Design a protein around this nucleic acid. Structure first.
Ligand SMILES: [Zn+2]
Lengths: 147, 91, 124, 136, 71, 119, 74, 75, 195
RNA sequence: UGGUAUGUUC
RNA sequence: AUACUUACCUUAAGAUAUCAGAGGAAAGUCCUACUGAUCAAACAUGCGCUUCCAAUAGUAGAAGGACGUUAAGCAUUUAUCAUUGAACUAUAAUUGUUCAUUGAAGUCAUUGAUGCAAACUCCUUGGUCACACACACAUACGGCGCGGAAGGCGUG
């Protein structure tokens, strides 16, 4: 933002328990933050996120006094986006059912089998696909840690 | 402005730059920035008292640059044209 | 050579300048462009410097002093504005002011024709 | 252990070294021993192990005492010493290789001048090297 | 403003000349938009004495930052 | 208040700019930029010797004066008389003003007076 | 846990010593007021070009770029 | 994972790990001490500061050090 | 905004990602290549005259020109000079792309050959040729070209190719001569060489 | 309501 | 070309000459194909304005180059550091001197570098214009042919 000195002040000012602190950023990746850059952004994250809480949380995990209801809060966040986009990929499979195209769930969007490996690798290295991939394997890892 | 954009024209061509310490460097220009940070590759490096070495890559902070010498064809680049007309930009 | 009294660095495009830097070195070349930070682009600029051995002939006391000047040739360089200290004008442009006007009117004509063509081509 | 000690405790280094040491004049043994040493340095860089670099320089220079007419390995030892950064030692390797041939070799003069072009940066001297190359 | 393009130099050994004489070589762990740099296991090349477990360098004082590794 | 807007008002007056080298530029002043880029015209660059015998002077600024192209070849002292110099602003240490001009007319900031009347 | 701007606001109207970066000159005096650029105004100040004290100074404005450090004095 | 240099200075604050601060040369001292608070401009305040010529040097107590001078902050 | 004077096209707000994506675009890259090809062609073939400052010939000069004679001028036709200037421009182009590469052919079996002449295994530009290849995103061009690539490794020793001469080589190619001066050659060779 | 970019089909 | 697929983006604000006077929507704001004065730009247009524009009645010359030769010109000056052994001078732990050994770096050069100076060869540039082959001038010099280049100043 404008001059570099002004840009830093924002970072240092952000460096310097749950009422005003978001939990989804503090567990892992805040799913508000992950596709905020791309078109499918729901919007800005309404609860505040800090780096100082992340350092304190890394201190608290490293000491070992973890508190799992925080992870239950984060799992309660993940379930909405997982179920919504699972409905939406079944919508995609219904559209693909009802020039070769295939539907990729792990981005939630269309690909072709005709395209080669490097263009498909380009699509697989995306904001949407990687936000989805961190979202999904974190979701399945939390589920298997519950079970 | 034009001079920084001329430095962006020279990407992938052998440039030679002399830093403010006195060192000279001649190598391909891989990347350059709006701040004038430059990254030279396969660079022949001459120290101020004259010793020459070979470096694989170097990143110089652009504050330290005295001058940069780009290839000589770039005087015909279109950003030097005075009388020039644009295609009416879109929404 | 006489230079117009109200001639700023925007007027002196294609004149041959004499740029002086902080380390005592003079850069001589055709001026191509400049910027907010005052960093030039010089077409055929040739660097000159006075060696430390020749330098004590400049100190105040033959009639005329003769200074062998170590010059390097570099071409189409961009200088950095932080180092520039003052600029002086050495030589006028190649083309005359009238002939420069003729060239500019010609180039305006040709450019307008080309964008008119590019428009009518994108329509069809 | 580092990549050097992993190289020096390899089973192959013993046999390759020892076959060279048994049969000095057979040269396929020297080339296998040298290729293995250079390949066990996955990336040659300015930070690779100084014991391993000293081992590489000893191998090429002893091979160029045994077989002083191999032009391509004088060029290769010069280019390796260039990549490591010191152009002075690469000058001395080219001039050593020219000396093995009594100055009279086209491949070494051609490669030494294509090298010299980049690193001389003094014009009278660069041209005097072409006038020296042309008489031989 | 714009962060420098050093994403390719991360976690690799690097030699940079602080001021005009000092030469510090370390592993690059992070960078700032001023070209501040923090590198672990630094050493000051002259015999050469190690600095410390974690150092930061103000990029005002860095001139050039060539990389002594693969990139 | 910016005194550069004061300094732009001069515009046709013989000044002497003393730069950070030690070199002093005497001459008729044309425009001044908002970064204090003086453009003088009929200038007489000079480098004052330090009147003590053993003390040398700036040596880099001797080289800079000779390399301007205007040093008179017979001249004893470092003076260089050259039409049109242009000076980047960070170089100026101080500007010796003429004796004659009235400060109390010139130092009135029209914009400050403008807002202060308006508010 | 005290940052530099609250540190300078805390030292207002307190004895402080500022040393400039040049000659190890130091001015010891009471701090009147400070800027956003940390320009310093000192009252009843004394001047130490070495350990040697040369004089006493009434009020000084010390320009922001020259100061190496500012310390609180006993 | 990247550690930006704000984070490294803040870890020096948070663990109170004693730092040696290399000022830029032609001054010729170093500051040993502990970092209590740091600025956006890399001004730092130092508790129990010692200055050292270039290990017998004088103590300073608590100082504010202007960040224009600092060259290295090492531990 | 960002405007590419090569491509003559505006785009939306330039971000380093969007702009860096544009500058390596294919359409942009062929248009930029064309631009500098045309400008180099111009600074070759610009046909423009110096001013001629003509001095009044002295009488002592003008007697000795009266002695000598008029000398005949050869001038081609229009169609003739059209053909001949096409031919001359073609000769300068193929004489510019001519390079002498004999010494790479002569050393083709030598023991350290791969390390010096392959040019992908060299120690100075070995990494750079590796970086130079492309993203190679369209592999359909790679499958359309159905040759084998046939790379030379660095690990070759002189055990392979022990006797080079066992039908493996072909003769050195004869020295090329100028086609305009092709009747200059001696008519018959000295010895009777079969085949 | 857009731009550039990418590759497929015809 | 179309179309479709993705991937990357979708913004610092504000302003358009100044001062004074008359009018319109007690303080200020806004505006006036309103009016003065100053400034700046363009375009015309002038000054007895100032500087510069090359032999042919001859084989020249002026300005600027050479990253050109003579040229190894002529005169000076430079070519490592540590350890150990041996002889050695000596007021001396062996400071000085020579020979070998281990380690560490090490731009090329010594036909170099630096100081001085000269000859020669060659490149680019120009009104190689017109009328003249002329006895001038103290207020020192008709600046009283047509153009061109560059500035200074004035008017519209
Ligand atoms: Zn483009």
């Amino acid at each position: 933002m404008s001059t570099p000195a002004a840009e830093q002040r924002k970072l240092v000012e952000q460096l310097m328990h749950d009422p005003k602190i978001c939990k989804s950023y503090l567990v892992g990746e805040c799913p508000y933050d992950l596709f905020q850059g791309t078109k499918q952004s729901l919007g800005k994250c309404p609860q505040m996120h800090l780096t100082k809480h992340k350092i304190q949380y890394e201190r608290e995990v490293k000491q070992g006094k973890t508190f799992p209801e925080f992870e239950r809060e984060y799992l309660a966040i993940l379930s909405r986006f997982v179920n919504e986009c699972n409905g939406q990929i079944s919508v995609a499979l219904q559209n693909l059912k009802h020039q070769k195209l295939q539907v990729c769930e792990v981005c939630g969007a269309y690909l072709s089998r005709l395209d080669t490996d490097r263009r498909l690798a380009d699509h697989f290295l995306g904001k949407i696909h990687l936000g989805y991939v961190k979202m999904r394997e974190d979701y399945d890892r939390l589920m298997k840690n519950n079970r | 402005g034009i001079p920084v954009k001329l430095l962006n024209e020279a990407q992938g061509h052998i440039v030679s730059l002399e830093l403010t310490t006195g060192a000279t460097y001649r190598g391909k220009l891989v990347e350059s920035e709006d701040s004038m940070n430059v990254q030279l590759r396969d660079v022949i490096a001459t120290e101020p008292q004259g010793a020459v070495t070979h470096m694989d890559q170097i990143f110089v902070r652009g504050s330290q640059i005295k001058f940069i010498v780009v290839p000589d064809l770039l005087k015909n680049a279109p950003l030097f044209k005075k009388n020039s007309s644009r295609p009416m930009p879109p929404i | 050579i006489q230079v117009a009294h109200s001639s700023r660095l925007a007027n002196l495009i294609d004149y041959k300048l004499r740029v002086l830097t902080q380390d005592g070195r003079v850069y001589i070349g055709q001026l191509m462009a400049f910027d907010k930070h005052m960093n030039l682009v010089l077409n055929e600029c040739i660097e000159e410097r006075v060696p430390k051995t020749q330098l004590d002939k400049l100190r105040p006391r033959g009639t005329t002093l003769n200074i062998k000047v170590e010059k390097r040739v570099l071409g189409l360089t961009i200088l950095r504005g932080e180092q520039i200290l003052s600029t002086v004008v050495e030589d006028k442009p190649l083309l005359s002011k009238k002939e420069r006007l003729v060239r500019d009117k010609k180039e305006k004509k040709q450019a307008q024709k080309q964008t008119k063509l590019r428009k009518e081509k994108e329509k069809k | 252990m580092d990549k050097y000690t992993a190289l020096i405790h390899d089973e192959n280094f013993s046999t390759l070294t020892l076959n060279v040491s048994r049969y000095p004049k057979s040269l396929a043994y020297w080339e296998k021993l040298l290729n293995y040493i250079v390949k066990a340095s996955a990336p040659i860089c300015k930070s690779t192990e100084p014991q391993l670099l000293k081992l590489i320089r000893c191998t090429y220079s002893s091979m160029l005492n045994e077989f002083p007419y191999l032009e391509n390995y004088y060029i290769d030892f010069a280019l390796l010493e260039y990549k490591l950064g010191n152009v002075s030692m690469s000058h001395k390797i080219f001039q050593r290789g020219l000396q093995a041939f009594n100055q009279r070799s086209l491949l070494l003069w051609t490669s030494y001048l294509k090298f010299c072009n980049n690193v001389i940066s003094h014009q009278k001297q660069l041209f005097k090297k072409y006038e020296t190359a042309e008489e031989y | 403003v714009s962060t420098p393009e050093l994403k390719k130099y991360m976690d690799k050994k690097i030699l940079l000349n602080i001021n005009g004489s000092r030469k510090v070589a370390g592993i690059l762990r992070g960078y700032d938009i001023f070209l501040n740099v923090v590198l672990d296991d630094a050493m000051e090349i002259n015999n050469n004495h190690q600095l410390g477990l974690q150092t930061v360098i103000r990029g005002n004082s860095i001139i050039s930052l060539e990389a002594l590794d693969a990139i | 208040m910016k005194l550069v807007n004061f300094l732009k008002k001069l515009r046709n007056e013989q000044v002497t700019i003393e730069l950070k080298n030690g070199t002093t530029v005497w001459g008729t002043l044309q425009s001044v930029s908002p970064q204090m880029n003086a453009i003088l015209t009929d200038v007489k660059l000079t480098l004052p010797q330090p009147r003590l015998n053993k003390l040398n002077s700036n040596g880099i600024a001797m080289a800079s004066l000779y390399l301007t192209g205007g040093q008179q070849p017979t001249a004893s002292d470092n003076i260089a008389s050259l039409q049109y110099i242009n000076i980047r602003g960070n170089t100026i240490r101080q500007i010796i003003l003429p004796d004659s001009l009235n400060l109390d007319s010139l130092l009135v900031d029209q914009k400050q007076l403008n807002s202060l009347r308006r508010s | 846990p005290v940052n530099p701007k609250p540190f300078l606001k805390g030292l207002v109207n307190h004895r402080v010593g500022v040393k400039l970066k040049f000659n190890s000159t130091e001015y010891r005096g009471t701090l009147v007021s400070t800027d956003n650029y940390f320009n310093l105004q000192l009252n009843e100040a004394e001047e130490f070009v070495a350990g040697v004290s040369h004089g006493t100074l009434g009020e000084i404005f010390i320009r922001c770029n020259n100061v190496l450090y500012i310390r609180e004095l006993p | 994972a990247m550690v930006p240099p704000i984070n490294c200075i803040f870890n020096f604050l948070q663990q109170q790990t004693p730092v040696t601060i290399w000022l830029f040369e032609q001054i010729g001292i170093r500051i040993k001490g502990k970092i209590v608070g740091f600025d956006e401009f890399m001004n730092v305040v130092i508790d129990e500061a010692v200055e050292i010529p270039v290990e017998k040097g004088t103590p300073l107590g608590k100082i504010l050090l202007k960040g224009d001078n600092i060259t290295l902050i090492t531990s | 905004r960002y405007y590419c004077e090569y491509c003559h096209s505006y785009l939306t707000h330039d971000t380093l990602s969007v702009r860096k994506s544009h500058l390596v675009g294919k359409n942009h890259l062929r248009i930029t290549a064309d631009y500098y090809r045309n400008k180099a062609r111009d600074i070759i073939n610009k046909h423009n005259h110096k001013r001629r400052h003509i001095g009044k010939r002295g009488r002592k000069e003008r007697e000795n020109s009266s002695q000598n004679e008029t000398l005949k001028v050869t001038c081609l036709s229009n169609k003739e000079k059209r053909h001949i200037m096409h031919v001359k421009k073609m000769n300068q182009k193929e004489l510019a792309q001519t390079s002498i590469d004999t010494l790479k052919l002569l050393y083709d079996g030598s023991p350290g050959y791969s390390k010096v002449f392959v040019d992908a295994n060299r120690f100075d530009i070995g990494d750079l040729v590796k970086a130079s290849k492309l993203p190679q995103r369209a592999n359909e061009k790679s499958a359309h070209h159905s040759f084998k690539q046939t790379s030379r490794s660095r690990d070759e020793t002189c055990e392979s190719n022990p006797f080079p001469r066992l039908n493996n080589p072909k003769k050195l190619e004869p020295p090329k001569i100028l086609s305009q001066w092709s009747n200059t050659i001696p008519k018959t060779s000295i010895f009777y060489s079969v085949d």
